[PDB]
A paper describes a structure:
Alpha-hydroxy acids are oxidized by a family of FMN-dependent enzymes. These enzymes use molecular oxygen to convert their substrate to product with the liberation of H2O2 as a by-product. PaLCTO is annotated as lactate oxidase and its closest homolog in Pediococcus acidilactici proteome does not use lactate as a substrate. We describe here structural and biophysical studies of PaLCTO, which revealed FMN-dependent folding and oligomerization of the enzyme.
We generated a mutant (A94G) based on literature precedent suggesting that the mutation of the residue may convert the enzyme to accept also larger substrates. The mutant was crystallized in the identical conditions as WT PaLCTO and the structure was determined at 2.0 Å resolution. The superimposition of the mutant and WT monomer structures showed high structural identity (rmsd = 0.16 Å for C-alpha 337 atoms). However, in the mutant structure we only observed the open conformation for the main polypeptide chain (loop 4: S201 –A219) and we were able to build the conformation completely with all the residues. Mutation of A94G likely reduces loop dynamics and therefore is completely resolved in the structure. The structures lay the ground for future biochemical experiments to determine the impact of mutation on loop dynamics.
Residue numbers in the entry:
A (entry chain A), B (entry chain A), C (entry chain A), D (entry chain A): 1 to 369
Amino acid sequence: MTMINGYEQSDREEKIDILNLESLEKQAEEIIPAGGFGYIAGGSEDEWTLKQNRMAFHHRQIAPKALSGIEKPELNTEIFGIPLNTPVMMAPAGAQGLAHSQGEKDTARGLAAVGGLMAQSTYSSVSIAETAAAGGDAPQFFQLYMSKDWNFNESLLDEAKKANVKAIILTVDATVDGYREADIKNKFTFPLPMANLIKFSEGNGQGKGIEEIYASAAQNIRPEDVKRIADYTNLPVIVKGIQTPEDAIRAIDAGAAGIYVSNHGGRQLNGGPASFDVLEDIATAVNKQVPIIFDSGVRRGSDVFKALASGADLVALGRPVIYGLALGGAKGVQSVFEHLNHELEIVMQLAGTKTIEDVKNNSLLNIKY
Amino acid sequence: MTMINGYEQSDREEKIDILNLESLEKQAEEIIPAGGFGYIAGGSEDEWTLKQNRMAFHHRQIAPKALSGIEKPELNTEIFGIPLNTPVMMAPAGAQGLAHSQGEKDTARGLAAVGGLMAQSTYSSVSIAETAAAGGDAPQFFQLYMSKDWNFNESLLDEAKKANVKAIILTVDATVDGYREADIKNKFTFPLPMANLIKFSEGNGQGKGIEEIYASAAQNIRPEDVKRIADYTNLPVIVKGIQTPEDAIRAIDAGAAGIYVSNHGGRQLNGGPASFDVLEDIATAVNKQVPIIFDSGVRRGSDVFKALASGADLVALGRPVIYGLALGGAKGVQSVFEHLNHELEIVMQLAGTKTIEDVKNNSLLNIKY
Amino acid sequence: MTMINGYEQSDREEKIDILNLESLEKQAEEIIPAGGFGYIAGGSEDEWTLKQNRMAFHHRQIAPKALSGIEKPELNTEIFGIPLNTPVMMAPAGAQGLAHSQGEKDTARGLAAVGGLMAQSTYSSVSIAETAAAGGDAPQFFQLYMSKDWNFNESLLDEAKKANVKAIILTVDATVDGYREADIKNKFTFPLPMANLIKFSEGNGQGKGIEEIYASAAQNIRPEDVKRIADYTNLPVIVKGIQTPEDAIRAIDAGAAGIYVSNHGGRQLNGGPASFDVLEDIATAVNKQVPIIFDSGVRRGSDVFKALASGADLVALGRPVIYGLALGGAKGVQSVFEHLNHELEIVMQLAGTKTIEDVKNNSLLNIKY
Amino acid sequence: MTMINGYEQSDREEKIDILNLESLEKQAEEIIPAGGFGYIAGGSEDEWTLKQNRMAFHHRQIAPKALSGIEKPELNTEIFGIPLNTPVMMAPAGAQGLAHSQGEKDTARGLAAVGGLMAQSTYSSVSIAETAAAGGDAPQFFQLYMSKDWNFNESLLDEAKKANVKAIILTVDATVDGYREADIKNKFTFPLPMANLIKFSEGNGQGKGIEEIYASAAQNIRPEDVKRIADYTNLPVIVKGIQTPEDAIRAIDAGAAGIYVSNHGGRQLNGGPASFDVLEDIATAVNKQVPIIFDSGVRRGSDVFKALASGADLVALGRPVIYGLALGGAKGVQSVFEHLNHELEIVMQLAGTKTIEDVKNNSLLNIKY
Ligand SMILES: Cc1cc2nc3c(=O)[nH]c(=O)nc-3n(C[C@H](O)[C@H](O)[C@H](O)COP(=O)(O)O)c2cc1C
Ligand SMILES: Cc1cc2nc3c(=O)[nH]c(=O)nc-3n(C[C@H](O)[C@H](O)[C@H](O)COP(=O)(O)O)c2cc1C
Ligand SMILES: Cc1cc2nc3c(=O)[nH]c(=O)nc-3n(C[C@H](O)[C@H](O)[C@H](O)COP(=O)(O)O)c2cc1C
Ligand SMILES: Cc1cc2nc3c(=O)[nH]c(=O)nc-3n(C[C@H](O)[C@H](O)[C@H](O)COP(=O)(O)O)c2cc1C
């Protein structure tokens, strides 16, 4: 309905009927142009890690609780003193303009509607200021792709601070792009503007070209960069892409106020483990000294419960939210979170867990299947 | 042949040719309306637990016994001093009217014909009194879905006592319904009356609406509820839905006279383990202090043998009996139990086990496949 | 080409081109009538054990030997002082008339041609005397299905002794038939005469009916029956169907001069382990005090090598030989043994094993796949 | 485009677009005659080992490294003081004339273009002198199939020394050919000349027939043969086909200056383990006393990284290079190495490994999938 550089964007704004989150992919495939769809759906190399992100949830099982003496489970929780209606949040994803003309503005509205946490992205088709304006008083985190150019870093961080963002997510697992075959097969050219890079170019970036700003992304990321971002913003800094206990501890020693356990939805180091399979050992080393956010493969209520029980404080979604955004805009995003909340409330009742803390204190079984 | 609220019910009354119990599903799918069929066949979320209920029987193997010195195995056993011709019994299932116009009356007749134990259900399309009348002197258990309304609980328990039921099964693993996609895809409305709720409404329920009685089902179930039902009936109370050793012991401490190991045929907490995979550890903690009933996934003689050898005293069937009920009414149900008895007698002879006690004392192998 | 009771039998007599033994099944399926084919190919219940008989060979691996200093491996071996050109032998199979009009006479000729050991069966379509006459001076074992009628047992054993048989195989794992669905689906009636039962009827059986003789098969088999057959024949008695170390030792204590590790090609106790998976523990308890024969699932050279390396002295084939018999009679059987010998000689060269003893002393790897 | 003995050879000379190395097989299948294609693609028996060569890379996982402080990974390495731009090399393969009229001359050019190590083969369609002339100053190893005729061995070794080859690869795992069904199904006759055997016949072989020279290949290979080749050439001798730690140590004790861990691409001892599954235990026994070369199943960047991290110094490719040779000659071979280098550089950046030594010192995870 909206065209940008030859690419068709959804303008839909409606509640959507959701059977489950996995089925949103084939539904969204009918309306997202083939190149954009492949960009969103695909992982790196032969997609082994992407597939294992789903299958790894079967490595642990939830015990049904008999005679639990609870009813009406509550999804409410908190991070950094911010109250949330649900522990399910939006993973930062820079390609939401591939799904919808409103991009992260509609995603921001959907998260605000369910009282969930929104993460806005460096490469968004819409500006930090626009996305925060769309969300109103709803809490937002800002995901930074750090540049070699500290003028770029400080300009985007100042824009995030002006937009009242509550934390910075430093993404460190994409210093180069994974080898994604879908984009090669589709001969796909990313067709969207990058509103934050355009704004920097027009402001403190003194007219520097967009391709030059893009190419300035840092491949060399050190612990001292974490402390520098923390000192500059006086916001909590969360390191995203952690897949080992040792890296969690190095991040906390470098000044991180949070650990985001992620393999980038299996789009980066193919042949790395399923994200779920390293969560518990990471959480054991962290020992609750900072909040943990988990993503990569979460689709069912049982998956969310298992991630919380294995040491996550919040659980993020990427692809299912992008598909819901294409299918129904702001109300489409709302529908995805409401659907997953419903599947989680059922599991919590059957597992005897009244609150999100009770889920976190739940002991999963470990039979081999 | 019979229509109720637009829904077609079987009136068949015939012996059926059974290749195996798994094949009854595709046979019954030709005659049960699509919505009713999906309601019966389906499990929760992605049906992982439902599938594992079948595959988990491969986690243990039966040793053939050479030079066993036995012939003509005997299927006879006992629970609470009640003699039975077979250790295979009917799992309580509230939806038998979806298969057949006689519902649990035909099931009661089939179980009486093989000298097996019948369990009648709270939500049956036919009354406690009718089902007990159909069974004649055959032993029956009554499955209770406990209400917040103790007038409802005491009325149904009094009706069960008047019908000479020998034990109460308290089902505790369905305080909310699992998320079952088949009913969403089929847009299925349960079309049957609930004869026990209608009777309560007309009697001690003083005209209270059916939907209001239904909605009064307790989500908060505590150990003290078990003792209260035991004190009120002076019958043995069996807790159904136990999937952990700790919950077995809590149930016995609360006054349970039996443990029913079940995950509700994978219809409830999807992402929970296969029922077979927790049976042996539950039976080790119970240490024969009360009888154990096992269900969820039982289809072959080898499955029944493995459940008895892993600590079950009785093994229940759900779906295969519902399918046989659709296909042949009372004689259809009889055919299902006779078929599974035949497969079990073959295994017992080849395994060198003369009696059901010998099966229970059998040591299964544990190679990994 | 030959008709018996409506059933078409092969009369083929030719060398056959063999890609591998597994492919003989689809080749033979083109020429064996559907009912006979299903009788041969099928296993019991859902054929899990039958399938695992094949897959279990992957549980161990053969190390290639570098710098082995050997060439021209030799397949020669010995049992009870009988010289054999190959450790691959014929498993006793009572249904060879379903494949070919000559039945075990052609099988006897094929085994004689490769210098292999033939086992003739109780229920053969052709007599003990005819099969031994067909084999000439080639060594034969006789497989007994023990009757309750010791007049029957002693008559067949006397006939076996007159035919110069070198050992008795007592089959003990088929006291009842496994539940085989193929025969139910095909509505298959065994159409062949049982030449040994007819001969008994005409001789010491004093005209007793064939069905009555057949029905006299013993379901109660005790250790004292083994010693009785040994005392009566003064031949070595091998117990067939052993799947546990304890049963191997009980058989040796009862007077057995050999152990035949078998699950009857997955036709009997479905839900029992793969035959290969219990071989090594049985061989560890036997500790070479008597020869071990292994069968059930052997198709490739690597399978034969792995069975010998895991404690077998001889490895038997059932189904592949029956299929080769249908396809080419005596030369068809010869072709099957020559093909498997060729695959084994290649493995022995690459594994650095000069003789069959070197294979038996080989240490298999145990990586998990 | 070129015909030899009825067989069509590629004459292509072009850069090729590569999605991944696995997809080269179906691309090359469109242009290689069916018999030649089956000869290249196939393994022995049922191809279990061939399949496991691929699946075994999933037995270990690469940890993404957060805050790694590196960029621009370097692929440079060294063997025997020879500088290489990449640790990926050409496995010796005697059938390159089945892909292309230039055979190993084009392969030699492709390896020279990426600064990689070429291995020329005994049975090549082109001579040792021609292949070395094609490669210019690029380093080459010569793979020997040892004869019983030491006049043959010394003539080819003298030709290799004259061609400035830097090491001898003694292949010891093909003393007989594996049973390869593709050649049986295709009725395939190897149609190419063997230029090295023809040259020997015309020179020191004094007119001896090609079939007679071919048939003189040694099946009996001893440790003293390794020392004899080392003494005669004064070159490092690498033993190829090692699959056990014990055989690695026996090879080093016999005078080997290198170990080449290989199962010949699953073409030899089917039922042997996946090559990757024995690499680490071999490397633990070798303890860096000599270089290790690894092959069999390598297709992705993650595979190369995992082999280096598990104790390989160099990683060889067979089939993918043969397919690239068919598709684009010298530039086709170049394209295959450039593609795999690109996938490896991405993994090294995401894993935090600056150099090939850093990859070798990387600790892989070992979760079970
Ligand atoms: C299309 C797409 C774009 C993404 N862009 C970003 C990004 O800009 N920054 C970032 O930190 N992660 C990005 N991610 C990774 C997500 O934050 C998240 O780790 C991933 O989507 C989680 O896996 P899931 O999609 O299976 O839920 C992206 C993921 C997708 C699929
Ligand atoms: C259609 C249907 C209705 C059911 N209704 C009840 C019920 O009313 N009460 C109860 O305790 N269990 C109920 N169950 C669960 C059964 O008691 C039993 O646990 C289950 O069917 C066992 O698994 P199986 O079907 O694989 O044998 C029901 C199961 C099915 C399939
Ligand atoms: C069609 C058929 C008939 C058989 N009849 C007999 C028999 O009469 N006596 C016996 O001891 N075993 C019998 N067996 C079992 C074989 O001796 C042997 O254990 C089996 O075929 C081995 O497995 P395989 O077919 O996979 O090689 C029979 C097997 C088949 C398939
Ligand atoms: C068609 C073909 C011909 C081969 N010829 C030889 C050879 O002449 N000498 C040798 O040492 N290895 C030979 N090999 C084995 C390779 O050196 C190497 O071990 C194998 O191709 C590695 O597995 P991959 O193909 O999966 O990469 C050959 C392999 C193939 C597929």
